[PDB]
Write a protein that binds this ligand. Structure first.
Ligand SMILES: *[C@@H]1O[C@@H](C)[C@@H](O)[C@@H](O)[C@@H]1O
Ligand SMILES: [Ca+2]
Ligand SMILES: [Ca+2]
Lengths: 91, 235
């Protein structure tokens, strides 16, 4: 059906993957939307933060976690930092 | 709790029961190894409180229970029963020896003010306790839980006594029958977000169960988070 990525439809350095009759834009950190046109922000899906989102100086999101969790390497997820983190059922 | 069901062991591992001259007169929630949050109206001057974590059936020995004495009681500084029994209805209890955290004994998460409120507004919380299983009925032997929907402010104020909406919220069903009861006060109103539970309220008064109103009233935890964090900090 042809390569839909030939016309370079991804903004902001997104990587274009050709599917059947469509493309995906895999966005670099900080961008989202079908064409990587959006800046990740706290008011769209909580800035993709698993727990808490804030705007930092330099107007980028920063994610954070409650006590007993640490921010994962992906800078979004909150992973246990202690054996029995708050609010989880484990039986 | 009226109209709920039996918790399974370890389903609500942040839940504690408060025991005095009578057992299970109130509940509470584990903030951390040393601290419980409960309702101020549960913790009068002169009376001893014993806390039990890891409790399931209050008349059987499950080998999960951890009993602790209370060495310090901090009612919220605005609490005054003479003006309103259920306003600023929140208190912290310090335990004599730390709880040993495990699958049966686990703290509830407490988010900041903004996120606590967001979570509340998702509109459905879990309430739990060993309170009466119907009005004037027997105390529960096995921990009960119930899902209660958030009730809008206007509806809350029309149908319930002593409500100060800044500090409190209503929850329950328009058709009634399902509420916290005497013995549940001080226990948790909790909101689960993608497998992690957050404290959104303190059970204050089950007006429906008490036949004084159509809904349960709850202390809004969002208003008290900084105080909780400050007082209970272990470091
Ligand atoms: C393609 O993938 C995306 C996610 C970015 O890492 C780009 O830099 C890369 O070329
Ligand atoms: Ca194609
Ligand atoms: Ca027991």
């Amino acid at each position: 059906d042809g390569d839909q990525c030939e016309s370079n439809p991804c903004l902001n350095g997104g990587s274009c993957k050709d599917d059947i009759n469509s493309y995906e834009c895999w966005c670099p950190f900080g961008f989202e939307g079908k064409n990587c046109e959006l800046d990740v922000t706290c008011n769209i899906k909580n800035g993709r933060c698993e727990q808490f989102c804030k705007n930092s100086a330099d107007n980028k999101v920063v994610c954070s976690c409650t006590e007993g969790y640490r921010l994962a390497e992906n800078q979004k997820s909150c992973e246990p930092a202690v054996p029995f983190p708050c609010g989880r059922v484990s039986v | 709790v009226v109209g709920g069901e039996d918790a399974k062991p370890g389903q609500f591992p942040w839940q504690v029961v408060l025991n005095g001259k009578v057992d299970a007169f109130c509940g509470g929630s584990i903030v951390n190894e040393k601290w419980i949050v409960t309702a101020a109206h549960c913790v009068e001057t002169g009376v001893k409180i014993t806390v039990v974590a890891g409790e399931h059936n209050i008349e059987e020995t499950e080998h999960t229970e951890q009993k602790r004495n209370v060495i310090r009681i901090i009612p919220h500084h605005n609490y005054n029963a003479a003006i309103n029994k259920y306003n600023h209805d929140i208190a912290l209890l310090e335990l004599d020896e730390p709880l040993v955290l495990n699958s049966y004994v686990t703290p509830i998460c407490i988010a900041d003010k903004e996120y606590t409120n967001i979570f509340l507004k998702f509109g459905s919380g879990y309430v739990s306790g060993w309170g009466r299983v119907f009005h004037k009925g027997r105390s529960a032997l096995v921990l009960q839980y119930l899902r209660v929907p958030l009730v809008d402010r206007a509806t809350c104020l029309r149908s319930t006594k002593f409500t100060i909406y800044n500090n409190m919220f209503c929850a329950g069903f328009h058709e009634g029958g399902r509420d916290s009861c005497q013995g549940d006060a001080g226990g948790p109103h909790v909101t689960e977000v993608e497998g992690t539970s957050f404290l959104t309220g303190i059970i204050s008064w089950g007006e429906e169960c008490a036949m004084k109103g159509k809904y349960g009233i709850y202390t809004k935890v969002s208003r008290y988070v900084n105080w909780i964090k400050e007082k209970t900090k272990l470091t």
